[PDB]
Design an enzyme around this catalytic site. Structure first.
Site, short mmCIF file in Angstrom:
data_model
loop_
_atom_site.label_atom_id
_atom_site.label_comp_id
_atom_site.label_asym_id
_atom_site.label_seq_id
_atom_site.Cartn_x
_atom_site.Cartn_y
_atom_site.Cartn_z
N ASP A 19 0.88 -1.47 0.22
CA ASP A 19 0.06 0.00 -0.14
C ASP A 19 0.94 1.23 -0.02
O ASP A 19 0.40 2.31 -0.41
CB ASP A 19 -1.11 -0.17 1.17
N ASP A 53 16.71 -6.66 17.78
CA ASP A 53 15.76 -6.32 18.86
C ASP A 53 14.26 -6.40 18.60
O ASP A 53 13.37 -7.15 18.76
CB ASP A 53 16.34 -5.24 19.79
N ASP A 70 -7.52 -10.74 10.99
CA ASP A 70 -8.78 -10.92 11.06
C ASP A 70 -9.68 -10.09 9.75
O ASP A 70 -10.63 -10.23 9.78
CB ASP A 70 -9.71 -10.60 12.48
N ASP A 89 8.78 -7.59 18.91
CA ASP A 89 8.27 -7.81 17.62
C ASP A 89 7.09 -6.95 17.35
O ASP A 89 6.07 -7.13 18.27
CB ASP A 89 8.27 -9.10 16.96
N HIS A 91 3.76 -7.02 14.42
CA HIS A 91 3.11 -7.23 13.25
C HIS A 91 2.03 -6.29 12.82
O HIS A 91 1.25 -6.11 13.67
CB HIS A 91 2.67 -8.80 13.40
N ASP A 93 -1.43 -6.13 10.60
CA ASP A 93 -2.22 -6.63 9.52
C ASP A 93 -2.31 -6.12 7.86
O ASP A 93 -2.80 -4.93 7.97
CB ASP A 93 -3.72 -6.66 10.16
N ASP A 94 -1.87 -6.64 6.93
CA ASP A 94 -2.01 -6.14 5.41
C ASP A 94 -3.33 -6.08 4.94
O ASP A 94 -3.36 -5.77 3.86
CB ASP A 94 -0.86 -6.99 4.71
N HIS A 113 2.21 3.40 18.28
CA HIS A 113 1.47 2.71 19.32
C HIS A 113 1.87 1.17 19.61
O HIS A 113 2.45 1.03 20.72
CB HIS A 113 0.02 2.70 19.00
N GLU A 114 2.18 0.36 18.68
CA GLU A 114 2.63 -0.69 18.73
C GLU A 114 3.87 -0.75 19.37
O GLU A 114 4.37 -1.53 20.27
CB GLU A 114 2.74 -1.61 17.44
N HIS A 117 4.01 -0.71 23.05
CA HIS A 117 4.01 -1.93 23.46
C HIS A 117 5.47 -2.94 23.27
O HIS A 117 5.73 -3.36 24.40
CB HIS A 117 2.94 -2.92 22.68
N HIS A 123 -1.84 -1.11 27.36
CA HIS A 123 -2.91 -0.04 26.97
C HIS A 123 -3.48 0.91 28.22
O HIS A 123 -3.40 0.64 29.15
CB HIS A 123 -4.13 -0.76 26.36
C1 LIG Z 1 -10.58 -0.13 13.93
N1 LIG Z 1 -9.92 -1.06 15.02
C2 LIG Z 1 -9.54 -0.74 16.44
O1 LIG Z 1 -9.51 0.46 16.67
C3 LIG Z 1 -9.50 -1.88 17.19
N2 LIG Z 1 -7.75 -1.61 17.72
C4 LIG Z 1 -6.82 -2.40 17.15
O2 LIG Z 1 -6.70 -3.37 16.75
C5 LIG Z 1 -5.44 -1.55 17.60
C6 LIG Z 1 -4.15 -1.84 17.13
C7 LIG Z 1 -3.24 -0.79 17.48
C8 LIG Z 1 -4.32 0.44 17.65
C9 LIG Z 1 -4.08 1.78 17.82
C10 LIG Z 1 -4.87 2.45 18.78
C11 LIG Z 1 -4.76 3.88 19.04
C12 LIG Z 1 -4.08 4.54 18.45
C13 LIG Z 1 -3.55 5.94 18.67
S1 LIG Z 1 -4.60 6.77 17.25
C14 LIG Z 1 -3.94 8.56 17.52
N3 LIG Z 1 -3.36 8.75 18.74
C15 LIG Z 1 -3.01 9.96 18.95
C16 LIG Z 1 -3.39 10.81 18.10
C17 LIG Z 1 -4.19 10.72 17.00
O3 LIG Z 1 -4.70 11.41 16.34
N4 LIG Z 1 -4.42 9.33 16.81
C18 LIG Z 1 -3.00 12.61 18.45
C19 LIG Z 1 -2.18 12.04 19.86
C20 LIG Z 1 -2.22 10.68 20.13
C21 LIG Z 1 -3.09 3.71 17.36
C22 LIG Z 1 -3.22 2.47 17.31
O4 LIG Z 1 -5.73 -0.21 17.79
C23 LIG Z 1 -10.12 -1.80 18.49
C24 LIG Z 1 -11.61 -2.09 18.05
C25 LIG Z 1 -9.64 -2.89 19.75
CA LIG Z 2 12.82 -9.03 19.17
CA LIG Z 3 -7.64 -6.56 10.63
CA LIG Z 4 -2.92 -3.83 2.60
ZN LIG Z 5 1.45 -11.55 14.97
ZN LIG Z 6 -2.42 -1.96 21.28
#
Ligand SMILES: CNC(=O)[C@@H](NC(=O)c1ccc(-c2ccc(CSc3nc4c(c(=O)[nH]3)CCC4)cc2)o1)C(C)C
Ligand SMILES: [Ca+2]
Ligand SMILES: [Ca+2]
Ligand SMILES: [Ca+2]
Ligand SMILES: [Zn+2]
Ligand SMILES: [Zn+2]
Length: 160
Positions: A19, A53, A70, A89, A91, A93-94, A113-114, A117, A123
């Protein structure tokens, strides 16, 4: 989960989503690690061979940890806490569409975010935190790491 005993960490992009271009992917991950190195004494260095790492890959459905992805939407990515081999590590989701903006899921935000972790963060309960479980794109012009995430990462590694 435990923290990293060392401040210098490495990563490696094992594969790449179609992408975005290779260099958009690399820019995104660079900006995401900077989120954390800018507020800690941590440092991140990319490798092109060997095991780093933090090993970064793109997967879909089942992909070897037997925490499958999923499909479109739903789980977007996940990552492992500090530790050897699988630890650290990340991963992605592509089956998501990855973009540099909002035309799908923003790779920089999900990586920042990841990688939190990857470094030991859980979280957050604060819906304004980067470490909150639900993704949002607030579209702001300049990213500023929220206070909850600053305090959690500085609680593990202190500041710079
Ligand atoms: C669409 N699905 C989801 O959101 C699911 N979440 C995930 O699978 C997942 C993986 C990683 C993340 C994730 C969650 C929150 C954020 C932060 S997004 C964000 N953060 C900030 C700003 C912003 O604009 N966006 C400004 C300051 C901090 C990033 C990844 O969600 C949820 C239903 C469990
Ligand atoms: Ca590692
Ligand atoms: Ca997905
Ligand atoms: Ca893709
Ligand atoms: Zn995985
Ligand atoms: Zn998370």
């Amino acid at each position: 989960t435990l923290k990293w005993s060392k401040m210098n960490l490495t990563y490696r992009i094992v594969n790449y989503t179609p992408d975005m271009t290779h260099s958009e992917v690399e820019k995104a991950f660079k900006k995401a690690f900077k989120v954390w190195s800018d507020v800690t004494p941590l440092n991140f260095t990319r490798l092109h061979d060997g095991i780093a790492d933090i090993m970064i890959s793109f997967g879909i459905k089942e992909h070897g940890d037997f925490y499958p992805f999923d499909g479109p939407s739903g789980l977007l990515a996940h990552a492992f806490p500090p530790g050897p081999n699988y630890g650290g590590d990340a991963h992605f989701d592509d089956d998501e569409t990855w973009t540099s903006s909002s035309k799908g899921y923003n790779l920089f935000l999900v990586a920042a975010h990841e990688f939190g972790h990857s470094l030991g963060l859980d979280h957050s309960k604060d819906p304004g935190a980067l470490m909150f479980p639900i993704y949002t794109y607030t579209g702001k012009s300049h990213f500023m790491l929220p206070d909850d995430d600053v305090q959690g990462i500085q609680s593990l590694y202190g500041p710079g």
